Paper text:
For instance, the U5 [name] 200 kDa helicase ([name]; Brr2p in yeast) unwinds the initially extensively base-paired U4 and U6 snRNAs during spliceosome activation and releases U4 snRNA and all U4/U6-associated proteins, necessitating re-assembly of the U4/U6 di-[name] and the U4/U6-U5 tri-[name] after splicing. Both helicase cassettes comprise dual RecA-like NTPase domains, a winged helix (WH) domain, a helical bundle (HB) domain, a helix-loop-helix (HLH) domain and an immunoglobulin-like (IG) domain.
We have previously characterized the interaction of [name] with two splicing factors that are also largely intrinsically disordered, [name] and C9ORF78 (34,35). This observation supports the idea that the [name] CC serves as a latching point for diverse intrinsically disordered proteins (IDPs) that either function during [name] assembly ([name]) or during different stages of the splicing cycle ([name], C9ORF78). Instead of full-length [name], we employed a C-terminal fragment (FBP21200–376) that encompasses the [name] CC-binding region. These observations indicate that [name] exhibits a higher affinity to SNRNP200HR compared to FBP21200–376 or C9ORF78 and prevents binding of the latter two proteins.
Author numbering:
A (entry chain F): 336 to 342, 357 to 375
B (entry chain B): 406 to 2125
Write the structure that this text describes.
C-alpha cells in the first residue's frame, strides 16, 4: 500500500586471515 | 432604532391570504350558477404551438452517463427539452416555474445527474463519498415516493437515496451512509439547528427546493431561513452550492429568482398553464349554502352528478379530506347510484363480464373493499394493508376500478394519473390551528397535476368542490393570478434566535445584514405599502437599513426580556444565554420559555409538572370541543395522575390526552385523534427541553421526575408497572401476571429460570424471561475518593457492565447520566454524560471528576447513574464521609513587599552587571525581594511564583554567588522537560560561556560522555532521568558528591507524571548533602503552591527563606476567561468551537499576537484552515499578515509543506511535531518578528516554545487515549504552563487567556487556575525500580534501612498532612510507621518474587543478578522479569522481536484515532505475522513498527515519529536481552540477539544481503553486483576503483560517499592466545588473551543512515561450545584504537575440548569473525 524508502578512493589493504562467520541461511 | 409591532405588520390567515386583487379569468372559461351553487368551467388550453427549429430531445442525444436513469422513455417532453441544456451543461442556479404535473422531478433528476457526472471517476464507477445531494420536499408522503422513485431510477449508478426521518443520532448515521437525502423543510431545518449537518456540510453540492412556492403557506419562515442560511454560507465560506427551485406558475416569480440568487437571463424558466403536457379542464364549484347539514347534503349529489358524466368512459379519482371519509363517501356514492334507476349497471359496465371477471376473482379480500370492488368502486387510503394498497393501485392502472375515492396521500405517494379527478370538501381539520381550515395551496396543485394520463388522454377535465366564499382564492391560485408573499414577519424572533445560537450573527450589525438575504426584504423592496412602509419612508432609505435595525431592536429586547439571549443597548452585541440555546435546539417559541421560567421551580410535584406542560404556548390555540366533552369525562377517571386546577379547560384536555396516550387508552372519536397525535409528537420535544432546562440549574428532584416522564412518553409506559414491557417480544399476559405479584424487579436477578417459572407458574417460558432479566441494563459502581484540597475532592468512579449485550434490544450504544447529589438530595453538585459503546461492553470504565465539599461535612453524597432511555434503570451508591480527614489548611502566601526596585548595579562585580545591564536597568519586584536572600546568603531557598515571573533570574543569582564564592565550582540545573533543558542550555550558553567564559554543558544519554562533561563542565543542564542514571552510583563517583549548587526547576511537577524520578533525585541529593559533611546548597523554583511549607521542609529550606507568592503577583496582569460548551461528542464539540476561536480573536486581541493550542497534530491543520476561511469570510481579508509578501518569499522558499505555505501567505501559521526543526525555527522567527499574527500549535509542543503572545487560547482541554480508549483531560500543570505563555512584559500591559472547555470541567478550572494548587507525591506507585537500584549499590541492606530511606522523600512529608490521599486511616506516628512498613514489605516481596533481590531471615536483602542487569541499563523491573521468563534456549529473531516489543517501556506509546485501519493494513505487509492481535494494544503496534522499519518500507509520516521513538528505546533492551541470555548460558539466542541489534541499526533483515547497507543502493544495483561475484563490503574496499565505478552507476557523490562509507566500515584484526595451554588441568582456571588492532584510526561515530540517534561501535567477544549450545564466557567492550582483553572460565573434565571464539559487532553486519581453537 506504500513505497519503500531507500537510503574519494580507499585501497588500504594488509595481509590477513580474513575469516568471517557464515550466513547460515538464518 | 424604533420598536415596530410585529402583529400588525404580518398578514394573517396564512396561505389563504391572497395578494391577488381581481383574478382575471382566461378566455377559455365560463361561469354558470344552478340552485345554491355556481360552477366555473375552464376548458383545457390547447398546448402552445411548437416554434421553429424546436423538437423534443431524443434520449440518445444527451450525455452517455445520463443515458442511464432515463430508460423506458423515448424522448424528454417539451419542458425537459427546454431545460436540459441548463440542467446538464451549466452549473447555474435554476428556478423552474411550470404547471404541476409537468415533470419537474425529471429536471431535478437531470441536475442530480449533472452532480453525479462531476464524479464519473474511471471504469464506469462513481465516487460515492465525494458528494451529497439534498432534496427538499413539502410532504412526507411525497418524500417516501421520491425516495422509492429515485432509488429505482439511480440504482445503476450504485447511489443510495433515503429519507431523513428518525432520531438525530439515527439521522447522523443515515446521512453518512447515503448520497441523496430527501426530507421535509422542517426536518432539514431542525437537523441544521441541532448541528447534525456540520460534518458533511462540505459534501453538499446540490440542493433542490421542490415546491418552492410554498413560502406563502406560513412555512415561509422555515424555508426562507434555510435558503438565506445557505446563500449566506456560500458568501461566508466562498464555497459553491447549486440551488434548484421548482415552483408553480405564479406572479412575482422574478422576486423568488432574486431571492434564490438566480440569473433571470440564464437560470430563469417560466411556463404558463398552456405548457401543461396533458391538457386538462379546471372545474370549480362554489356552494353558497350556509347551514352545514344542507351544504354537506348538496355535496353528495354534486359528486354523483359529475360522476355520471364519465360513468362509462373515464376513470374518475375522487379525493376526500380524512381517512375515514373515504369509505363513507364510496358507500354513499354507491348507494346513491344504485337506489335510483340503478345507474351502476353502466357505471360498472360489466358488458357480460368482459372486464368484471378480474374483480370477481379479486373479491377475496378481508376489508370493506370486498363490498365495493365487484361494483367497480374502490378506496385507497393510508392504513388498510400494504398489499391492499398495491393491489388497488395495480388494478386501477389496468383501467378496472371505474371510480376510486382516496385521500390526499395518493397524489404524493404513487404516480397514479387518471382522466377525471374531483376534489371534494377542500376543508381539512388543522390540529395546529385547532380548527377547520382550507387545505394548502400546494396540495391542490399537486392533486390537479395527476389528472389526465400522459399518453392515453387527449384532455381530462378536473373538478373542485369548495364553499362559494373561497372560490376566488382557488381560481386565483390555478389561473396564476395569485402572487406569493412573505410571512417572515410573524416568526421573526425565533429565526433570529436560531441564527444567534448558530453563531452566524454575533452582533446586531450582522443580523441587520442577515435580513438582507431574506425573501421578506425583497418583498418589502418591491411592495413597501403592503408591508406597512410608506412611500416617503421608502424614499428615505433606499435599502431600508434603518427599518431592519428597528425590527432587530424589537426582537432583541423581546428575547432579552425572556432571558433567551442577553442584549446590550450600548453596543448591540448578542450573548447566547444557555436557556436560549435549549430553546433553539428544541423549536420552542419565546413565549413557551417565558412561561417555563415563571412556572418551573425546584419543588414542583409530578401533578404540577403535567399542568406546567399543558400550559405551553404551542397549544395556546387548542380548545375543547363540546361534542367530545362527554367522552373526555370517562377518560379522566381512568388516567392515573389526578388533574387538579382543571374544569375541562384546554390545559385539562391536554393533560388528560397525554395521560391517555401514556396509558395507551383507546379512543372512539375521530377529532380527538388529530389532537391526540399533535400533542404527542410535540410532547417528546418539550419534555426533553424542560429536562435540559432543569438539568443545568442542578435541581435534583425535578430533573429525575422530568427524565422519568421523558422515558415514559417515549416508551408509552408508567413507572408503576413492570419494566419488562420495554421488550416488545414478551407476551403481555405474562407481564400482567408478573405485575399481579407484588414482587420487586431486582429480586428477579438472583432467581434462576426454573424458580422464575414456578413463581409465575408458567415454567415453559421460564427460561426466556430469565434471558430478558439478564438483558436489562445494569451497572456496578465503585468509588475511590481522594481529598485534593480542604474544599474539593477527586472521585474516581469505576463502572462495570453486568448484562449481556444484544444488538437487537440494546443497539450500537447506551447512554447514561452520572449525577452527584448532596445529602439532602435536592441539588446536583455535578452531572456528566456517559456513553457505553457496544464494542467496549463488559469492560471496566473509569470516570474521574471533582466535587466540592464544605466545612461542616454532610454524612453522604449520592452518586446515581441513570439510563437515558430505559425506565427503572438507575444505580445509586452512597459515598460516605464518616472516616474522611481533610487536608490541613494551608498558610497564607508570602506577601509581596513594596520594596524600592533594585538597580542592576547592586551586583558587586562589573562583569556580572554586564550580563543584564543591556536588557533592563531594574529588576521586577519579585526578584528584588528574593535577591538579598539568594545572592547575599548561603542557604537552601524555595521560590514560588507564577510562571513568567523570571525565576530563572533567581537561579542565575544563585549561580553568580557560587562563581563569586569559588572560581571553579559546579552547579547542576535539573528541569523536568527535555525541551526546557535545551532552551535553558541555549540561553546560558549565550549568557555564561560567551561572556563569563565558564563551561556550560548539557547531559546526554551515554554515561561516559556524561561523566566527561560533569568532570569538565561548570554548569550541568539535565533532566531527571539523565541525572538519575549518574547519581545512582554516587558513592563511587567523586564528582557527583562535591557540587556547590543544585537548582531544581518546575518543582511542582513532582505531583504529575514523571514526578517520582524528580522526587527521588532530589531526596538523594539531600541525603548526599547530609552524608558528605559539606552542605550542598539547594535552590528550588516552582509555581505557587498551597503546601509550600511541606516542600520547604522537605528540601530543608528555612521558614524565613521560603517565598510563596500568590498567582495575582504576576508582573503582567492576567485576564482569564473560561468558556464552557455543553457538548459531549468531541468532533461535534470542536466543529462548533472553531468559530468562537475567531470571534475571541477579534474581540480580545485584534492587532496583537495570538497563540492557539489544539489537542492533536491532525487537528492543527484543520483549525488553521478553518480560521483562515473564516477570516476570508469576513469583510477584512488577510488581516493576520502585517508584512509584505515580497519579504515573505525568501522565508517561504525554505518551507516544504504546501498547506503551510498557503496559510502563511494569509497570516496564519501552525506548528506541530511533524514539522522539521528548521521549519519550526523559521515559523517561530516569523511570529516573533511580527510578520504573522496567529499561530496554531499542537498542545504536546507547548513546552518546547520560546515565543510569547498577547492572547492565548486553549482549544479543548482534552485528548484521546487509545490504551484506555477514552478521552482524558490535560494535566493541570500542563494547562497552567500553556496559560503562562501569555506574557509580553516589554510592550503589552496585560495578557489574556481564553480557555474553552466542555461545560463539565468549567467549574474545576475556576477552582484551580486562579489560586495556588496543591502537589501530591506519586512515589508510592512507582517505587520498585528505585528500591532495586538502591539495593544494587548497597545503599539499602535491610528493611530498616529502606524505612529510614523513605523518610527523606516528599511522600513521608505528605502522608502526615493529607492522609486519605494515600489510603492512610490515622495521623499518629504509629499509623505512619505501620503504613511505611507495609509498603516497603510489599515492594520487597515483589522484588523477591521477580528474583531481582534475595531476602534472607526476612530481615536482610541482597542484590541478585537480574537486579544488577535491571539497574545497570536503567530498565523497569517488570521488563527484566518478562525477559527472564519468556526467553528460552531456542528463541530466534522472531521470538526476540516479539519479546522486546512486549517491554514495559513501550506501554506509554500513543494510540491515536483511526490508526487501527492503517495498522491492520500494515500488519499484512510485514514478513512475520502475529497471532490474532488486538490493534489497540501498544505492544502490538510496537512489534508492527519494528517489523516495518526492519524491512526498510515507508509508512505515512504521522506514524513515522513513533518508529524513531521505538528505535531510540530499543537498543538498551536488546543489550539487556543479550546480558540475560549470557547469564543463562545460551549461545544461539545470544548470537541471534546480537544479529538483531546489528540489523535494527542497519534497518535490514538478516536474510537480506549485506550490500543493502551501502547508501544509494537498490535491488537492481545489488543484482548487477551479485552475478559479478561481489557479495561483501570488504571486496569493495578491495576493488580497483574503476571496476566499482563502471559496474555501479554513480555521480560524483555516489562513488564519493559510498567509498567513504567503506572507510567508515570497521575492519579490525585480532589475535588470540591461550595462556599456558600446556600446563592446564580439569577444574583449573582457563584464561585466554585477545589482542584487537585497527590500523585505521577511528573518525567519528557509526554511520547509521536510517537509525535516528547517533551511535558508537560496540563489540562482543564470546567463547562458546557450538555442539552443546553453551555460552562459556562473554565480554562487552568498545574499541578505540587497540585493546587487550582477558577472558576466563573453568575447564571441564576429560581434558580435550574444542570451543569457538566469536567476535560480533552491534552496528555493522558482516564483520563477525569466528576462530576455532582446542584445549588440553
Amino acid at each position: 500500500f506504500k513505497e519503500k524508502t531507500v537510503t574519494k578512493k580507499r585501497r588500504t589493504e594488509n595481509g590477513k586471515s580474513r575469516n568471517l562467520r557464515q550466513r547460515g541461511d538464518d | 432604532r424604533q420598536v415596530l409591532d410585529l402583529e400588525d405588520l404580518v398578514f394573517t390567515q396564512g396561505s389563504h391570504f391572497m395578494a391577488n386583487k381581481r383574478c382575471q379569468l382566461p378566455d377559455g372559461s365560463f361561469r354558470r350558477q344552478r340552485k345554491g351553487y355556481e360552477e366555473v368551467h375552464v376548458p383545457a388550453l390547447k398546448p402552445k404551438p411548437f416554434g421553429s427549429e424546436e423538437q423534443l430531445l431524443p434520449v440518445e442525444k444527451l450525455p452517455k452517463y445520463a443515458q442511464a436513469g432515463f430508460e423506458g422513455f423515448k424522448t424528454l417532453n417539451r419542458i425537459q427539452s427546454k431545460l436540459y441544456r441548463a440542467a446538464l451543461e451549466t452549473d447555474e442556479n435554476l428556478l423552474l416555474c411550470a404547471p404541476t404535473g409537468a415533470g419537474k422531478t425529471n429536471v431535478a433528476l437531470m441536475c442530480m445527474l449533472r452532480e453525479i457526472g462531476k464524479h464519473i471517476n474511471m471504469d464506469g464507477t462513481i465516487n460515492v463519498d465525494d458528494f451529497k445531494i439534498i432534496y427538499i420536499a413539502p410532504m412526507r408522503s411525497l418524500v417516501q415516493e421520491m425516495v422509492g422513485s429515485f432509488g429505482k431510477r439511480l440504482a445503476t449508478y450504485g447511489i443510495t437515496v433515503a429519507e431523513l426521518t428518525g432520531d438525530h443520532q439515527l439521522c447522523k448515521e443515515e446521512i453518512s451512509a447515503t448520497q441523496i437525502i430527501v426530507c421535509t423543510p422542517e426536518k432539514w431545518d431542525i437537523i441544521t439547528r441541532k448541528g447534525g449537518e456540520r460534518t458533511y456540510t462540505q459534501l453538499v453540492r446540490l440542493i433542490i427546493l421542490d415546491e418552492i412556492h410554498l413560502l406563502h403557506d406560513d412555512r415561509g419562515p422555515v424555508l426562507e431561513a434555510l435558503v438565506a442560511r445557505a446563500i449566506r454560507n456560500i458568501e461566508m465560506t466562498q464555497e459553491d452550492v447549486r440551488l434548484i427551485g421548482l415552483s408553480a406558475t405564479l406572479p412575482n416569480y422574478e422576486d423568488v429568482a432574486t431571492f434564490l440568487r438566480v440569473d433571470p437571463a440564464k437560470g430563469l424558466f417560466y411556463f404558463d398553464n398552456s405548457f401543461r403536457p396533458v391538457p386538462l379542464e379546471q372545474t370549480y364549484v362554489g356552494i353558497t349554502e350556509k347551514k352545514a347539514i344542507k351544504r354537506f347534503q348538496i355535496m353528495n349529489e354534486i359528486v354523483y352528478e359529475k360522476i355520471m358524466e364519465h360513468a362509462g368512459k373515464n376513470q374518475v379519482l375522487v379525493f376526500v379530506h380524512s381517512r375515514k371519509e373515504t369509505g363513507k363517501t364510496a358507500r354513499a356514492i354507491r348507494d346513491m347510484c344504485l337506489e335510483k334507476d340503478t345507474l351502476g349497471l353502466f357505471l360498472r359496465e360489466g358488458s357480460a363480464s368482459t372486464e368484471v371477471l378480474r374483480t370477481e376473482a379479486e373479491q377475496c379480500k378481508n376489508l370493506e373493499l370486498k363490498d365495493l370492488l365487484p361494483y367497480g368502486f374502490a378506496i385507497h387510503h393510508a392504513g388498510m394493508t400494504r398489499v391492499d394498497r398495491t393491489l388497488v393501485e395495480d388494478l386501477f392502472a389496468d383501467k378496472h376500478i371505474q371510480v376510486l375515492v382516496s385521500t390526499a396521500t395518493l397524489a404524493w405517494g404513487v404516480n397514479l394519473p387518471a382522466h377525471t379527478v374531483i376534489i371534494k370538501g377542500t376543508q381539512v381539520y388543522s390540529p395546529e390551528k385547532g380548527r377547520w381550515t382550507e387545505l394548502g395551496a400546494l396540495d391542490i396543485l399537486q392533486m390537479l397535476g395527476r389528472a389526465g394520463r400522459p399518453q392515453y388522454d387527449t384532455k381530462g377535465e378536473g373538478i373542485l368542490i369548495t364553499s362559494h366564499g373561497e372560490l376566488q382564492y382557488y381560481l386565483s391560485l390555478l389561473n396564476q393570478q395569485l402572487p406569493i408573499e412573505s410571512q417572515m414577519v410573524s416568526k421573526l424572533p425565533d429565526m433570529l434566535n436560531a441564527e444567534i445560537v448558530l453563531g452566524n450573527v454575533q452582533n446586531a450589525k450582522d443580523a441587520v445584514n442577515w435580513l438582507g438575504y431574506a425573501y421578506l426584504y425583497i418583498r418589502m423592496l418591491r411592495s413597501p405599502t403592503l408591508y406597512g412602509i410608506s412611500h416617503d419612508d421608502l424614499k428615505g432609505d433606499p435599502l431600508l437599513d434603518q427599518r431592519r435595525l428597528d425590527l432587530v431592536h424589537t426582537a432583541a429586547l423581546m428575547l432579552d426580556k425572556n432571558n433567551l439571549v442577553k442584549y446590550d443597548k450600548k453596543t448591540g452585541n448578542f450573548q447566547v444565554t444557555e436557556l436560549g440555546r435549549i430553546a433553539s435546539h428544541y423549536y420552542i417559541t419565546n413565549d413557551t420559555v417565558q412561561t417555563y421560567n415563571q412556572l418551573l421551580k425546584p419543588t414542583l410535584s409530578e401533578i404540577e409538572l403535567f399542568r406546567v406542560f399543558s400550559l405551553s404556548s404551542e397549544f395556546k390555540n387548542i380548545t375543547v370541543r363540546e361534542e367530545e366533552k362527554l367522552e373526555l369525562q370517562k377518560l379522566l377517571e381512568r388516567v392515573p395522575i389526578p388533574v387538579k386546577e382543571s374544569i375541562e379547560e384546554p390545559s385539562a384536555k391536554i393533560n388528560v390526552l397525554l395521560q391517555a396516550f401514556i396509558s395507551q387508552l383507546k379512543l372512539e372519536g375521530f377529532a380527538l385523534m388529530a389532537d391526540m397525535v399533535y400533542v404527542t409528537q410535540s410532547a417528546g420535544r418539550l419534555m426533553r427541553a424542560i429536562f435540559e432546562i432543569v438539568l443545568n440549574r442542578g435541581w435534583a428532584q425535578l430533573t429525575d421526575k422530568t427524565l422519568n416522564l421523558c422515558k415514559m412518553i417515549d416508551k408509552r409506559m408508567w413507572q408503576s408497572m413492570c419494566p419488562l414491557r420495554q421488550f416488545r417480544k414478551l407476551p403481555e399476559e405474562v407481564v400482567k401476571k408478573i405485575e399481579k405479584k407484588n414482587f420487586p424487579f431486582e429480586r428477579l436477578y438472583d432467581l434462576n429460570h426454573n424458580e422464575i417459572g414456578e413463581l409465575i407458574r408458567m415454567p415453559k417460558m421460564g427460561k426466556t424471561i430469565h434471558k430478558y432479566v439478564h438483558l436489562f441494563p445494569k451497572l456496578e459502581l465503585s468509588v475511590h475518593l481522594q481529598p485534593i484540597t480542604r474544599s474539593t475532592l477527586k472521585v474516581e468512579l469505576t463502572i462495570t457492565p453486568d448484562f449481556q449485550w444484544d444488538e437487537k434490544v440494546h443497539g450500537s450504544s447506551e447512554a447514561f447520566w452520572i449525577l452527584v447529589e448532596d445529602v439532602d438530595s435536592e441539588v446536583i453538585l455535578h452531572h456528566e454524560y456517559f456513553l457505553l459503546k457496544a464494542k467496549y461492553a463488559q469492560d471496566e470504565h473509569l470516570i474521574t471528576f471533582f466535587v466540592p465539599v464544605f466545612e461542616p461535612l454532610p454524612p453522604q453524597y449520592f452518586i446515581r447513574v441513570v439510563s437515558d432511555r430505559w425506565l427503572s434503570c438507575e444505580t445509586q451508591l452512597p459515598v460516605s464521609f464518616r472516616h474522611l480527614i481533610l487536608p490541613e489548611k494551608y498558610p497564607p502566601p508570602t506577601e509581596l513587599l513594596d520594596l524600592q526596585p533594585l538597580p542592576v548595579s547592586a551586583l558587586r562585580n562589573s562583569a556580572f552587571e554586564s550580563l543584564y545591564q543591556d536588557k533592563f536597568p531594574f529588576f521586577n519586584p519579585i526578584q528584588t525581594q528574593v535577591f538579598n536572600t539568594v545572592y547575599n546568603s548561603d542557604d537552601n531557598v524555595f521560590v514560588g511564583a507564577p510562571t513568567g515571573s523570571g525565576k530563572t533570574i533567581c537561579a542565575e543569582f544563585a549561580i553568580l554567588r557560587m562563581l563569586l564564592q569559588s572560581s571553579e565550582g559546579r552547579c547542576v540545573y535539573i528541569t523536568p522537560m527535555e525541551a526546557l533543558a535545551e532552551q535553558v542550555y541555549m540561553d546560558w550558553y549565550e549568557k555564561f560561556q560567551d561572556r563569563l567564559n565558564k563551561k556550560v554543558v548539557l547531559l546526554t544519554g551515554e554515561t561516559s560522555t556524561d561523566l566527561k562533561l560533569l568532570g569538565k563542565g561548570n554548569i550541568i543542564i539535565s533532566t531527571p532521568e539523565k541525572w538519575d542514571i549518574l547519581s545512582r552510583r554516587w558513592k563511587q563517583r567523586k564528582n557527583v558528591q562535591n557540587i556547590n549548587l543544585f537548582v531544581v526547576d518546575e518543582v511542582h511537577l513532582i505531583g504529575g507524571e514523571n514526578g517520582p524520578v524528580l522526587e527521588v533525585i532530589c531526596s538523594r541529593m539531600r541525603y548526599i548533602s547530609s552524608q558528605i559533611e559539606r552542605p550542598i546548597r539547594i535552590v528550588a523554583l516552582s509555581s505557587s503552591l498551597s503546601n509550600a511549607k511541606d516542600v520547604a521542609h522537605w528540601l530543608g529550606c528555612s521558614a524565613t527563606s521560603t517565598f510563596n507568592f500568590h498567582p495575582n503577583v504576576r508582573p503582567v496582569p492576567l485576564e482569564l476567561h473560561i468558556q464552557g460548551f455543553n457538548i459531549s461528542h468531541t468532533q461535534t464539540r470542536l466543529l462548533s468551537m472553531a468559530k468562537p476561536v475567531y470571534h475571541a480573536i477579534t474581540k480580545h486581541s485584534p492587532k496583537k499576537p495570538v497563540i492557539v493550542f489544539v489537542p492533536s497534530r491532525k487537528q492543527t491543520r484543520l483549525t488553521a484552515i478553518d480560521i483562515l476561511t473564516t477570516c476570508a469570510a469576513d469583510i477584512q481579508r488577510q488581516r493576520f499578515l502585517h508584512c509584505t509578501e515580497k519579504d515573505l518569499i525568501p522565508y517561504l522558499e525554505k518551507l516544504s509543506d504546501s498547506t503551510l505555505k498557503e496559510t502563511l501567505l494569509n497570516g496564519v501559521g501552525y506548528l506541530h511535531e511533524g514539522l522539521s526543526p528548521m521549519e519550526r525555527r523559521l515559523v517561530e522567527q516569523l511570529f516573533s518578528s511580527g510578520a504573522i499574527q496567529v499561530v496554531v500549535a499542537s498542545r504536546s509542543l507547548c513546552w518546547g516554545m520560546n515565543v510569547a503572545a498577547h492572547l492565548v487560547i486553549i482549544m479543548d482541554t482534552q485528548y484521546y487515549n487509545g490504551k484506555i480508549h477514552a478521552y482524558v483531560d490535560y494535566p493541570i500543570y500542563d494547562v497552567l504552563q500553556m496559560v503562562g505563555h501569555a506574557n509580553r512584559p516589554l510592550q503589552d500591559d496585560e495578557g489574556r487567556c481564553v480557555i474553552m472547555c466542555q461545560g463539565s470541567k468549567k467549574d474545576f478550572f475556576k477552582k484551580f487556575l486562579y489560586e495556588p494548587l496543591p502537589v501530591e507525591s506519586h512515589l508510592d506507585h512507582c517505587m520498585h525500580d528505585h528500591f532495586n537500584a538502591e539495593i544494587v549499590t548497597k545503599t539499602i541492606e535491610n528493611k530498616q534501612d529502606a524505612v529510614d530511606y523513605l523518610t527523606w522523600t516528599f511522600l513521608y512529608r505528605r502522608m502526615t498532612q493529607n492522609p486519605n490521599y494515600y489510603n492512610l486511616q490515622g495521623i499518629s506516628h504509629r499509623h505512619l510507621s505501620d503504613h511505611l512498613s507495609e509498603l516497603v514489605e510489599q515492594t520487597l516481596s515483589d522484588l523477591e518474587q521477580s528474583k531481582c533481590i534475595s531476602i534472607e531471615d526476612e530481615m536482610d536483602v541482597a542484590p541478585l543478578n537480574l537486579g544488577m542487569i535491571a539497574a545497570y541499563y536503567y530498565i523497569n523491573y517488570t521488563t527484566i522479569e518478562l525477559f527472564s521468563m519468556s526467553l528460552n534456549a531456542k528463541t530466534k529473531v522472531r521470538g526476540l522481536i516479539e519479546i522486546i516489543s512486549n517491554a514495559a517501556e513501550y506501554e506509554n506509546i500513543p494510540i491515536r484515532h483511526h490508526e487501527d485501519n492503517l495498522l491492520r493494513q500494515l500488519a499484512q505487509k510485514v514478513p512475520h505475522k502475529l497471532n490474532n492481535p488486538k490493534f489497540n494494544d501498544p505492544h502490538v503496534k510496537t512489534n508492527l513498527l519494528l517489523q516495518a522499519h526492519l524491512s526498510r518500507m515507508q509508512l505515512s509520516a504521522e506514524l513515522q515519529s513513533d518508529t524513531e521513538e521505538i528505535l531510540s528505546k530499543a537498543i538498551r533492551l536488546i543489550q539487556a536481552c543479550v546480558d540475560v541470555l549470557s547469564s543463562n548460558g545460551w549461545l544461539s539466542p545470544a548470537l541471534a540477539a546480537m544479529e538483531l541489534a546489528q540489523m535494527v541499526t542497519q534497518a535490514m533483515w538478516s536474510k537480506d544481503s549485506y550490500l543493502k547497507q551501502l547508501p544509494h543502493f537498490t535491488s537492481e544495483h545489488i543484482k548487477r553486483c551479485t552475478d559479478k561475484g561481489v557479495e561483501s563490503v570488504f571486496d569493495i574496499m578491495e576493488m580497483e576503483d574503476e571496476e566499482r565505478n563502471a559496474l555501479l552507476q554513480l555521480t560524483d557523490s555516489q562513488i564519493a560517499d559510498v567509498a567513504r562509507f567503506c572507510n567508515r566500515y570497521p575492519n579490525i584484526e585480532l589475535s588470540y592466545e591461550v595462556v599456558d595451554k600446556d600446563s592446564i588441568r580439569s577444574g583449573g582456571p582457563v584464561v585466554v588473551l585477545v589482542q584487537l588492532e585497527r590500523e585505521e584510526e577511528v573518525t567519528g561515530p557509526v554511520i547509521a543512515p536510517l537509525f535516528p540517534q547517533k551511535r558508537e561501535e560496540g563489540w562482543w567477544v564470546v567463547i562458546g561450545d557450538a555442539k552443546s549450545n553453551s555460552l562459556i564466557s562473554i565480554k562487552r567492550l568498545t574499541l578505540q584504537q587497540k585493546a587487550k582483553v582477558k577472558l576466563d572460565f573453568v575447564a571441564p573434565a576429560t581434558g580435550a575440548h574444542n570451543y569457538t571464539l566469536y567476535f560480533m559487532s552491534d552496528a555493522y553486519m558482516g564483520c563477525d569473525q569466528e576462530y576455532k581453537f582446542s584445549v588440553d
